[PDB]
């Protein structure tokens, strides 16, 4: 959920993942893999799944000094302002819950997500995400201030959760590698490790064993040491890049914080109008605004009626029948008239 | 399914027959009230001295 | 030069640059000049030519921390973190060695180099370059991440150099000025300072004679005297601000960092298609991806070979004759069908 979020943080330790685009050419086991871009909102605040613990505590302390994530040693810990959403510029961070970080970003088709608090020169990734502001109404801008807009809006939740729906984190697996232990081909050293390392050799009982216990290994393989990946008291969500080193599929639940509520919307009203009223037809002369989807629909018979995104200081002949038009040239009530 | 499907779906209602519901302000002589009836012909607008059927 | 890069650094001292694009209207001899850009890349690393010893210590050390540079006195250097590249935003820093610095910038009108230690919050400049990534492939997005396709793309070399292409590390230069001297009104006083010192008086030893130290000339009027500063033992190439009236035309050796090799690119494959085959005509409905070209070309003696900006959810009737066609729409092998 998101209420006493230490329990949801403290069920599993966070896990890092081999992303494919992570710093201009690299795929690597970053803690800044975008697990997904969850933007289910008319309000347009992206709740993207961080690869680390979204508000992850290194002792399970949900305090802004600890934005803890997947490191080599279990806490990739950093300063909680250290993230950076780079849509076209520094998108505003709105909060961190569980494994996801929610925030408003600038407009775009590709969003980068970075963390530098212990983050690797600001360890960052960059995915594609078509954050385009499809706002309601005719108008096309992010400006509340001249208060004319009172519309419905799909707002992202701004508080932490209680429980809305659980992403399942559990069952600490591994994913295939070659670099666990050390050995000269009959002289094997296996020590404590930052990941749950299975103990593998080329001959003998070395195949597995996710312990951090020191041992010498003979009668095996020089590259044959299979220091395996696993977990204990950890587990990723789904392992998108993320190899599945579980035997059985299972996890516990966690709520993506800020479940979206039906909020309002302040869209700006446009400039008012010009109505030249001649014979059988009206001319709507409008000056420009931020661009407006204006609709002139003739009310009456089989409906001669049009609508277009108008974007200049222009004039349109709304046809003025005996039935009349509906000139919604902007975000007012579109009320037309009769002949005169 | 998406998690916002319960947050927001899309309705594809195949059409049945429909009923137009109306409301007539009546200046029924010196009576002056409003009646609001389903206009199917069965509802009797019990006016003050009126049994209207819209 | 590239391996012992301190050899090519210690051959020629760094210079200052009379850049006109220097801070919103003013432009003078700043250290934030840019000599030229290097665009040999399908990958598109701008190889900017930096005026300073960016990637060389001010003591001539191989100091990856010390982003060296030039003042009037030789070591006008800071940390390497003060180097910033802003094209339309903070582009990716790629690599630095001395006068060469390559990096992956975003889309932008002018690439802006900025040194910020003394150059007060990034004293820099923005030279005008069309940074448009001409992506190969039938599709056109900047998406590495999913396994879409490998493409051969000529990429810039991203390693340390040894030598491939000699920058003319020579031309002991000259320059213009008016201010190199001093004098108390009949005592012309020169000091040891950051100009290779010629004297130019109305007459005297501050009209001819050495300038690397203090010299007093009695009975000298102030309108007579003038200190001149030339260059020697190295230089920038042709002095793009750099008024090089030095009489000895002579060159030195420098190596451009990382000349390009045939690299790859993670090509984004799109959704495929929907076939609807009619009476000798075909209709491929394309759902949209990030925008690409789709080319319908006939099968036989010349069929209607047309291209199309595949940039939306639409359908195209590639008319599949008895001779047939080839439906290239995206990143597939474009083999169309025959009449059936």
XYZ file of C-alpha atoms in Angstrom:
734
model
C 0.000 0.000 0.000
C 1.396 3.406 0.941
C 0.309 4.245 4.498
C 2.906 2.717 6.833
C 5.217 2.270 3.891
C 8.120 0.876 5.914
C 6.481 -2.569 5.885
C 6.109 -2.543 2.102
C 9.699 -1.349 1.862
C 10.897 -3.863 4.423
C 9.364 -7.012 2.967
C 11.937 -7.210 0.179
C 15.302 -5.554 -0.206
C 15.547 -3.568 -3.461
C 17.115 -5.087 -6.575
C 19.031 -3.611 -9.508
C 18.532 -4.543 -13.138
C 20.403 -4.720 -16.433
C 18.872 -1.897 -18.452
C 19.672 -1.548 -22.143
C 20.087 2.225 -22.571
C 21.781 3.680 -19.527
C 24.176 6.507 -20.273
C 24.779 6.866 -23.990
C 25.643 3.420 -25.245
C 25.516 1.195 -22.239
C 23.202 -1.403 -20.850
C 24.213 -2.189 -17.310
C 22.880 -3.296 -13.960
C 21.708 0.128 -12.885
C 19.351 0.915 -10.036
C 17.805 3.422 -12.444
C 16.085 1.118 -14.864
C 12.628 2.474 -15.641
C 10.519 -0.540 -14.692
C 7.621 1.100 -16.516
C 6.105 4.503 -17.185
C 2.726 4.477 -15.486
C 0.866 7.621 -16.485
C -2.826 6.949 -15.950
C -4.115 10.480 -15.537
C -5.757 13.402 -17.293
C -3.749 15.639 -14.966
C -0.490 14.433 -16.518
C 1.842 13.517 -13.662
C 3.850 10.425 -14.550
C 4.227 7.733 -11.884
C 7.172 5.857 -13.369
C 8.515 2.695 -11.746
C 12.000 3.328 -10.405
C 14.504 0.514 -10.380
C 15.390 1.314 -6.787
C 13.184 1.653 -3.725
C 10.898 4.634 -4.355
C 11.528 6.274 -1.036
C 13.619 3.212 -0.149
C 15.169 3.371 3.317
C 18.620 1.920 3.966
C 17.414 0.897 7.419
C 13.818 1.032 6.179
C 13.652 4.628 7.371
C 11.417 6.550 5.006
C 13.232 9.866 5.362
C 14.447 12.102 2.541
C 18.110 11.595 3.409
C 17.572 7.938 2.500
C 16.532 7.328 -1.063
C 17.866 3.775 -0.913
C 17.929 1.567 -3.973
C 19.654 -1.484 -5.385
C 23.399 -1.152 -4.887
C 26.022 -3.896 -4.873
C 25.754 -3.908 -1.133
C 21.938 -3.957 -0.693
C 21.349 -0.221 -0.250
C 22.055 1.965 -3.222
C 21.548 4.910 -0.900
C 21.432 8.553 -1.888
C 19.971 11.984 -1.185
C 16.279 12.049 -2.030
C 16.589 15.222 -4.078
C 19.276 13.477 -6.156
C 16.883 12.244 -8.869
C 16.324 14.052 -12.155
C 13.461 13.537 -14.580
C 14.760 14.777 -17.930
C 11.820 14.993 -20.308
C 13.142 17.996 -22.140
C 14.509 19.550 -18.940
C 14.361 18.938 -15.204
C 10.824 17.675 -14.634
C 9.548 18.314 -11.123
C 9.752 15.420 -8.703
C 6.432 14.956 -6.976
C 7.088 12.071 -4.583
C 8.495 8.595 -4.125
C 6.458 5.594 -3.005
C 7.578 2.002 -2.720
C 9.340 1.302 -5.983
C 7.767 4.042 -8.137
C 8.480 7.765 -8.340
C 5.659 10.123 -9.320
C 6.222 13.623 -10.685
C 5.367 16.100 -13.432
C 7.789 16.199 -16.358
C 8.103 18.474 -19.407
C 6.425 17.645 -22.717
C 7.940 15.021 -24.946
C 8.269 11.566 -26.458
C 11.382 10.428 -24.554
C 11.879 10.799 -20.799
C 15.151 10.160 -18.990
C 15.257 9.256 -15.306
C 18.386 9.791 -13.254
C 19.541 9.412 -9.676
C 22.691 10.982 -8.274
C 22.879 10.829 -4.501
C 25.331 7.959 -4.569
C 24.300 7.532 -8.210
C 27.006 6.796 -10.758
C 27.824 10.324 -11.870
C 24.089 10.711 -11.705
C 23.411 7.139 -12.861
C 20.555 7.540 -15.332
C 18.546 5.811 -18.040
C 16.434 7.193 -20.870
C 13.282 5.574 -22.241
C 10.671 6.707 -24.725
C 7.400 7.966 -23.258
C 4.987 10.105 -25.276
C 4.212 12.694 -22.587
C 2.012 14.970 -24.704
C -0.428 17.267 -22.935
C -3.791 16.151 -24.296
C -5.797 18.607 -22.219
C -9.544 19.034 -22.364
C -11.354 21.907 -24.037
C -10.403 23.959 -27.041
C -7.421 25.625 -25.348
C -3.858 24.316 -25.470
C -1.714 25.505 -22.546
C -0.699 24.938 -18.918
C -1.929 28.217 -17.422
C -4.537 28.244 -14.671
C -4.337 31.842 -13.630
C -7.128 33.733 -15.362
C -9.785 31.668 -13.648
C -12.198 30.603 -16.350
C -11.608 26.869 -16.532
C -13.786 24.608 -14.428
C -13.657 21.203 -16.076
C -13.216 17.601 -14.939
C -9.625 16.379 -14.866
C -8.053 13.003 -14.224
C -5.752 13.994 -11.390
C -2.946 11.810 -10.124
C -3.233 11.230 -6.382
C -0.905 13.520 -4.456
C -0.989 11.753 -1.117
C 0.608 8.456 -0.218
C -1.555 5.370 -0.582
C -3.232 3.060 1.863
C -3.718 0.167 -0.560
C -4.964 0.400 -4.131
C -3.418 -2.510 -6.008
C -0.314 -4.550 -5.361
C 2.657 -4.949 -7.617
C 4.190 -8.196 -6.431
C 7.729 -8.163 -5.088
C 9.131 -11.347 -3.606
C 11.167 -14.497 -4.332
C 14.713 -13.153 -4.759
C 15.968 -14.721 -7.957
C 19.073 -14.356 -10.033
C 19.678 -13.772 -13.750
C 22.563 -15.293 -15.745
C 26.155 -14.143 -15.274
C 29.720 -15.446 -15.050
C 31.495 -13.402 -12.385
C 30.573 -14.618 -8.888
C 33.542 -16.225 -7.134
C 37.318 -16.479 -7.420
C 39.606 -19.416 -8.143
C 42.763 -20.711 -9.796
C 41.196 -23.965 -11.062
C 41.744 -25.976 -7.835
C 42.198 -23.032 -5.501
C 38.799 -21.439 -5.127
C 37.951 -18.563 -2.801
C 34.289 -17.881 -2.046
C 33.643 -15.004 0.363
C 30.752 -12.847 1.518
C 29.023 -11.103 -1.384
C 26.743 -8.190 -2.269
C 24.325 -10.454 -4.099
C 23.157 -13.903 -2.990
C 25.904 -15.883 -4.694
C 25.388 -19.574 -5.410
C 28.576 -21.627 -5.050
C 29.442 -23.396 -8.310
C 32.406 -25.497 -9.446
C 33.180 -27.569 -12.547
C 33.356 -30.852 -10.617
C 32.176 -31.845 -7.179
C 29.213 -30.501 -5.232
C 29.844 -26.913 -6.272
C 26.786 -25.981 -8.277
C 24.778 -23.747 -5.957
C 24.371 -22.274 -2.497
C 23.450 -18.669 -1.918
C 25.533 -18.075 1.183
C 28.178 -15.503 1.979
C 30.468 -18.122 3.508
C 34.201 -18.403 2.951
C 35.434 -21.620 1.376
C 38.308 -23.017 -0.640
C 37.341 -25.105 -3.650
C 39.424 -27.736 -5.399
C 38.741 -30.299 -8.136
C 36.564 -28.016 -10.243
C 36.579 -25.509 -13.065
C 38.660 -22.349 -13.339
C 35.845 -20.585 -15.141
C 33.563 -23.337 -13.831
C 32.839 -21.506 -10.568
C 29.163 -20.655 -10.888
C 28.689 -17.884 -8.366
C 24.978 -17.759 -8.911
C 22.462 -14.995 -8.385
C 19.667 -15.397 -5.849
C 18.057 -13.503 -2.993
C 17.051 -13.797 0.649
C 14.392 -11.410 1.940
C 14.235 -9.669 -1.421
C 12.536 -9.895 -4.759
C 11.923 -7.768 -7.812
C 8.552 -7.002 -9.316
C 8.474 -8.977 -12.529
C 12.058 -8.974 -13.723
C 11.589 -7.151 -17.042
C 15.227 -7.435 -18.046
C 15.599 -9.108 -14.813
C 16.262 -12.873 -15.155
C 13.835 -15.126 -13.322
C 15.889 -17.155 -10.884
C 12.918 -18.411 -8.905
C 11.599 -21.948 -8.796
C 8.038 -20.891 -7.915
C 6.244 -17.705 -8.935
C 5.101 -15.655 -5.970
C 5.503 -12.311 -4.255
C 3.915 -9.909 -1.810
C 1.893 -6.842 -2.694
C 2.698 -3.136 -2.792
C 0.573 -0.138 -3.699
C 1.766 2.344 -6.311
C 1.319 5.539 -4.272
C -0.997 8.323 -5.303
C -3.964 6.482 -6.784
C -5.516 9.021 -9.130
C -8.680 10.845 -8.088
C -11.238 12.776 -10.107
C -9.854 16.297 -9.793
C -10.741 19.589 -11.398
C -9.177 21.421 -14.313
C -8.457 25.093 -14.890
C -8.328 25.467 -18.664
C -8.291 29.064 -19.907
C -11.242 30.547 -21.736
C -10.463 32.088 -25.093
C -11.067 35.580 -26.511
C -14.720 36.324 -26.883
C -16.043 36.859 -30.392
C -17.055 38.871 -33.424
C -20.471 38.282 -34.992
C -21.027 40.031 -38.316
C -24.673 39.344 -39.033
C -25.519 39.718 -42.687
C -28.042 37.793 -44.743
C -28.515 34.095 -44.012
C -25.000 33.734 -42.585
C -22.872 35.013 -39.738
C -19.168 35.771 -39.743
C -17.286 34.860 -36.580
C -14.179 36.997 -36.379
C -11.959 35.775 -33.555
C -8.543 36.964 -32.639
C -5.910 34.332 -31.841
C -5.193 32.703 -28.475
C -3.231 29.700 -27.521
C -4.877 27.544 -30.253
C -8.554 26.654 -29.999
C -10.750 23.862 -31.341
C -13.736 25.918 -32.485
C -16.971 24.218 -33.519
C -19.753 25.767 -35.600
C -22.509 23.177 -35.740
C -25.788 24.129 -37.348
C -28.764 23.104 -35.215
C -31.889 22.107 -37.083
C -32.274 19.667 -39.979
C -29.750 17.214 -41.362
C -26.877 18.952 -39.720
C -24.645 21.086 -41.874
C -22.062 21.678 -39.179
C -18.288 21.831 -39.036
C -15.538 22.204 -36.466
C -11.815 22.833 -36.771
C -8.831 23.621 -34.604
C -8.596 27.311 -35.503
C -5.235 28.868 -34.692
C -5.020 32.497 -35.850
C -6.817 35.823 -35.907
C -9.350 34.912 -38.556
C -13.030 34.923 -39.491
C -15.307 32.045 -40.476
C -18.720 32.151 -42.120
C -20.920 30.195 -39.724
C -24.008 29.553 -41.896
C -27.008 31.207 -40.329
C -30.084 29.142 -41.195
C -33.581 29.422 -39.774
C -32.573 26.588 -37.476
C -29.403 28.314 -36.339
C -25.869 27.342 -35.434
C -23.958 26.289 -32.357
C -20.787 28.342 -32.437
C -18.597 26.764 -29.763
C -15.552 28.786 -30.894
C -13.775 28.072 -27.666
C -14.746 26.925 -24.201
C -18.047 28.707 -23.634
C -21.619 27.588 -24.155
C -21.869 27.560 -27.964
C -25.272 29.327 -28.313
C -26.345 30.453 -31.782
C -29.222 32.628 -32.934
C -31.899 33.082 -35.583
C -31.822 35.080 -38.805
C -31.024 38.594 -37.578
C -6.652 -5.080 -18.208
C -5.388 -1.634 -17.331
C -5.636 -0.515 -13.707
C -7.514 2.631 -14.746
C -10.193 0.522 -16.441
C -12.233 0.671 -13.259
C -11.066 4.275 -13.116
C -12.370 4.820 -16.675
C -13.895 2.518 -19.295
C -15.547 3.045 -22.670
C -19.245 2.369 -23.159
C -20.607 0.595 -26.225
C -24.339 0.540 -25.617
C -26.360 -1.096 -28.335
C -29.526 0.942 -28.621
C -32.952 -0.110 -27.424
C -36.061 1.991 -27.898
C -36.012 5.323 -26.060
C -38.591 7.548 -24.371
C -38.821 11.339 -24.573
C -39.614 12.861 -21.166
C -41.045 16.382 -21.077
C -42.149 19.152 -18.732
C -44.900 21.613 -19.604
C -45.356 24.806 -17.701
C -49.121 25.172 -17.683
C -51.023 28.371 -17.308
C -54.130 26.240 -16.849
C -56.392 29.255 -16.783
C -55.635 31.061 -13.547
C -53.686 28.007 -12.422
C -49.998 28.377 -13.228
C -47.814 25.416 -12.337
C -45.331 23.053 -13.940
C -45.906 19.398 -14.796
C -43.131 16.989 -15.754
C -44.135 13.650 -17.238
C -42.801 10.792 -19.277
C -44.550 11.485 -22.532
C -45.601 7.955 -23.468
C -49.306 8.675 -23.034
C -49.939 6.673 -19.852
C -48.972 9.236 -17.204
C -51.823 11.531 -16.208
C -50.649 15.019 -15.280
C -53.081 15.480 -12.415
C -53.544 19.233 -12.781
C -55.724 21.256 -10.431
C -58.861 20.398 -12.331
C -56.662 18.851 -15.003
C -55.968 15.343 -16.181
C -53.453 16.205 -18.875
C -51.951 13.579 -21.142
C -48.964 14.872 -23.082
C 49.333 12.423 -30.150
C 47.100 10.494 -27.768
C 48.946 8.060 -25.485
C 51.453 10.323 -23.785
C 49.051 13.202 -24.392
C 51.135 15.352 -22.054
C 53.803 15.321 -24.792
C 51.510 17.046 -27.290
C 50.203 19.248 -24.486
C 53.686 20.259 -23.321
C 54.776 21.020 -26.884
C 52.423 23.996 -27.372
C 50.953 26.181 -24.635
C 47.180 26.832 -24.636
C 45.708 30.063 -25.990
C 42.815 32.469 -25.416
C 40.153 33.101 -28.022
C 38.544 36.279 -29.339
C 35.079 34.746 -29.634
C 32.231 37.059 -30.578
C 29.571 34.690 -29.201
C 30.464 35.121 -25.572
C 27.609 35.821 -23.188
C 24.578 37.423 -24.812
C 25.963 40.196 -26.969
C 29.454 40.740 -25.735
C 32.283 38.642 -27.126
C 35.977 39.059 -26.437
C 39.092 37.053 -25.700
C 37.465 34.476 -23.462
C 38.714 30.937 -22.897
C 35.346 29.691 -24.159
C 36.115 29.863 -27.868
C 35.341 26.863 -30.096
C 37.687 26.203 -32.992
C 35.516 23.771 -34.941
C 33.152 20.841 -34.538
C 33.691 17.242 -35.581
C 30.714 15.528 -37.179
C 31.877 12.173 -38.457
C 29.216 10.002 -36.909
C 26.059 8.102 -37.639
C 26.006 8.100 -33.842
C 26.747 11.813 -33.919
C 29.266 12.850 -31.302
C 30.125 16.492 -31.887
C 33.919 16.670 -31.703
C 34.334 20.282 -30.569
C 37.816 21.797 -30.686
C 38.371 23.381 -27.302
C 40.707 26.303 -26.816
C 42.061 25.074 -23.499
C 43.893 21.951 -22.362
C 40.611 20.214 -21.523
C 41.902 16.828 -20.485
C 45.390 18.010 -19.453
C 46.501 19.363 -16.081
C 47.649 22.964 -15.670
C 51.004 21.565 -14.542
C 50.991 19.404 -17.698
C 49.821 16.347 -15.778
C 47.485 13.706 -17.155
C 44.795 14.966 -14.833
C 41.279 13.768 -15.632
C 40.146 15.994 -12.784
C 42.079 19.040 -14.004
C 40.137 20.507 -16.911
C 43.037 22.757 -17.887
C 42.650 25.943 -19.895
C 44.298 29.254 -20.662
C 44.195 32.745 -19.197
C 46.598 35.511 -20.203
C 48.936 33.556 -17.978
C 49.153 29.922 -19.135
C 47.170 27.834 -16.645
C 43.629 29.171 -16.915
C 42.286 25.820 -15.816
C 39.626 24.513 -13.465
C 38.227 21.099 -12.586
C 36.918 19.016 -15.490
C 33.428 19.162 -13.942
C 33.243 22.852 -14.919
C 33.093 21.823 -18.589
C 29.500 21.876 -19.817
C 27.969 21.425 -23.273
C 24.560 22.994 -23.926
C 23.077 22.562 -27.396
C 19.347 22.672 -26.701
C 20.020 21.296 -23.206
C 22.924 19.743 -21.329
C 24.201 17.202 -23.855
C 26.138 14.085 -22.928
C 29.816 14.681 -22.311
C 31.694 12.101 -24.315
C 35.468 12.467 -24.050
C 38.156 15.058 -23.601
C 41.850 15.241 -24.420
C 43.626 18.592 -24.532
C 42.152 20.678 -27.308
C 39.743 17.954 -28.506
C 36.412 17.174 -26.816
C 33.679 14.988 -28.325
C 30.213 14.485 -26.872
C 26.624 13.533 -27.660
C 24.459 16.646 -27.648
C 20.683 16.833 -28.150
C 18.841 18.682 -30.913
C 19.849 22.342 -30.873
C 20.664 25.532 -32.783
C 24.146 26.188 -31.364
C 26.409 23.945 -29.307
C 27.599 25.858 -26.250
C 30.881 25.078 -24.532
C 31.090 26.449 -21.013
C 33.951 26.543 -18.559
C 32.742 27.439 -15.084
C 35.437 28.062 -12.545
C 36.438 31.607 -13.395
C 34.125 32.004 -16.382
C 31.421 33.061 -13.997
C 28.882 30.265 -14.064
C 30.093 28.840 -17.377
C 31.859 31.512 -19.378
C 31.251 29.923 -22.769
C 29.894 30.280 -26.292
C 27.252 28.809 -28.589
C 28.423 28.206 -32.144
C 25.681 27.561 -34.667
C 25.405 23.891 -35.631
C 22.410 21.954 -36.939
C 22.497 19.041 -34.491
C 19.994 16.820 -36.303
C 20.446 13.066 -35.972
C 19.926 11.647 -39.458
C 18.860 8.200 -38.310
C 19.252 5.253 -40.636
C 16.582 2.638 -41.161
C 13.067 2.541 -42.507
C 11.977 3.761 -39.063
C 13.148 7.033 -37.485
C 13.309 7.013 -33.654
C 16.152 7.295 -31.119
C 15.318 3.975 -29.424
C 18.064 1.524 -28.499
C 16.293 -0.485 -25.877
C 14.245 -3.407 -27.217
C 15.968 -5.889 -29.482
C 14.808 -4.355 -32.710
C 17.649 -4.673 -35.197
C 21.366 -4.166 -35.561
C 22.399 -1.685 -38.195
C 25.849 -0.768 -39.490
C 26.376 2.862 -38.560
C 29.623 4.774 -38.932
C 30.296 5.880 -35.375
C 32.940 8.132 -33.881
C 35.893 6.481 -32.164
C 35.320 6.633 -28.421
C 38.710 5.443 -27.221
C 42.025 7.073 -26.393
C 44.068 8.037 -29.420
C 47.574 7.373 -30.595
C 47.597 9.386 -33.824
C 45.347 9.467 -36.850
C 45.030 13.055 -38.041
C 47.486 15.832 -37.317
C 46.113 19.076 -36.003
C 48.714 21.700 -36.843
C 50.150 22.181 -33.365
C 52.348 25.004 -34.586
C 52.073 28.563 -35.738
C 53.695 30.555 -32.957
C 51.174 33.323 -33.274
C 50.604 37.032 -32.970
C 47.465 39.021 -32.089
C 46.027 42.587 -31.792
C 45.910 44.703 -28.646
C 46.503 48.090 -27.046
C 47.204 47.469 -23.369
C 50.375 45.410 -22.781
C 52.479 48.191 -21.244
C 52.513 50.556 -18.290
C 54.258 53.825 -17.516
C 54.210 56.695 -15.006
C 54.004 59.489 -17.594
C 57.736 59.677 -18.406
C 58.747 56.317 -17.008
C 57.546 53.591 -19.355
C 57.309 50.495 -17.151
C 56.943 46.945 -18.459
C 56.746 43.866 -16.217
C 56.913 40.101 -16.524
C 53.443 39.198 -17.801
C 51.357 36.959 -20.070
C 52.247 38.480 -23.447
C 55.321 37.607 -25.519
C 56.447 41.167 -25.368
C 57.384 43.475 -28.206
C 57.768 47.181 -27.474
C 56.196 49.860 -29.692
C 56.909 53.398 -28.514
C 57.219 56.711 -30.276
C 60.899 55.806 -29.867
C 63.029 53.751 -27.533
C 63.667 50.372 -25.927
C 59.952 49.970 -25.516
C 59.981 50.437 -29.264
C 62.501 47.624 -29.857
C 63.766 45.111 -27.331
C 62.776 42.123 -25.240
C 59.593 41.828 -23.193
C 59.486 39.105 -20.562
C 60.352 41.248 -17.545
C 60.412 44.703 -16.001
C 62.000 47.552 -17.934
C 61.819 51.275 -17.254
C 62.358 53.897 -19.943
C 62.822 57.469 -18.780
C 61.280 60.307 -20.783
C 58.517 58.305 -22.453
C 55.132 59.741 -23.397
C 52.147 57.490 -22.796
C 50.664 57.819 -26.276
C 53.939 56.504 -27.696
C 54.258 53.180 -25.855
C 52.473 49.885 -26.542
C 53.133 46.317 -25.372
C 52.776 43.573 -27.963
C 52.107 39.909 -27.254
C 52.800 37.167 -29.795
C 52.876 33.367 -29.537
C 55.744 30.916 -29.891
C 56.649 27.215 -29.762
C 53.081 26.121 -30.451
C 49.710 27.520 -31.330
C 46.173 26.851 -32.435
C 45.708 26.035 -36.074
C 44.790 29.007 -38.241
C 43.752 31.270 -35.374
C 39.980 31.521 -35.969
C 39.873 34.573 -33.782
C 43.601 34.429 -33.419
C 45.016 37.156 -35.692
C 48.137 35.279 -36.589
C 50.542 37.820 -38.007
C 53.456 35.705 -36.748
C 55.983 35.597 -39.569
C 57.124 31.986 -39.201
C 54.565 29.676 -40.783
C 55.287 26.298 -39.222
C 53.259 23.403 -37.884
C 53.292 20.861 -35.087
C 51.657 17.517 -34.403
C 48.378 16.925 -32.618
C 46.023 13.968 -32.813
C 42.244 14.207 -33.068
C 40.683 12.010 -30.362
C 39.018 8.786 -31.506
C 38.650 8.723 -35.308
C 35.504 6.941 -36.408
C 35.045 3.193 -36.931
C 32.164 1.165 -38.355
C 29.930 0.739 -35.282
C 26.331 -0.393 -34.961
C 22.925 0.981 -33.996
C 19.955 -0.564 -32.188
C 17.393 -0.046 -34.940
C 13.756 0.165 -33.819
C 11.565 -2.360 -35.596
C 7.942 -1.285 -35.810
C 4.663 -3.226 -35.745
C 4.376 -5.115 -38.974
C 1.178 -4.747 -40.957
C -2.304 -5.916 -41.903
C -2.856 -7.411 -45.369
C -6.134 -7.136 -47.277
C -5.784 -8.503 -50.780
C -8.268 -7.528 -53.439
C -8.732 -7.921 -57.162
C -5.134 -7.329 -58.196
C -4.672 -4.694 -55.480
C -3.405 -4.870 -51.907
C -4.202 -2.824 -48.809
C -1.649 -2.856 -46.010
C -3.019 -1.176 -42.911
C -0.160 0.159 -40.803
C -0.575 0.986 -37.230
C 1.767 3.791 -36.213
C 5.136 3.726 -34.477
C 7.609 6.585 -34.018
C 7.698 8.095 -37.522
C 9.321 6.255 -40.431
C 9.342 5.897 -44.209
C 7.458 3.099 -45.973
C 8.204 2.440 -49.636
C 5.976 0.506 -52.011
C 7.794 -0.669 -55.111
C 6.393 -2.850 -57.878
C 7.701 -6.196 -59.108
C 8.861 -6.033 -62.709
C 9.703 -3.552 -65.440
C 9.268 -0.407 -63.615
C 6.364 -0.696 -61.192
C 5.165 2.360 -59.282
C 8.059 2.846 -56.923
C 6.753 5.364 -54.432
C 7.763 6.221 -50.887
C 5.556 7.563 -48.114
C 6.108 9.147 -44.729
C 4.601 6.364 -42.631
C 3.711 8.619 -39.722
C 0.261 7.692 -38.404
C -2.333 4.956 -38.017
C -3.483 4.528 -41.601
C -3.710 2.188 -44.589
C -2.052 2.184 -48.014
C -3.225 0.199 -51.019
C 0.007 -1.097 -52.534
C -1.478 -2.366 -55.800
C -0.098 -5.860 -56.064
C -0.073 -6.631 -59.806
C 0.462 -9.953 -61.561
C 4.132 -9.030 -61.736
C 3.828 -8.241 -58.038
C 5.220 -5.666 -55.646
C 7.596 -5.216 -52.734
C 6.097 -3.776 -49.561
C 8.925 -2.131 -47.628
C 7.325 -0.448 -44.611
C 9.687 -0.380 -41.656
C 12.622 -2.588 -40.717
C 11.754 -5.825 -42.505
C 12.921 -7.462 -45.684
C 10.410 -5.771 -47.965
C 9.164 -8.771 -50.029
C 5.578 -8.249 -51.144
C 3.204 -10.852 -52.513
C 1.754 -11.773 -55.894
C -1.804 -11.845 -57.225
C -3.744 -14.069 -54.836
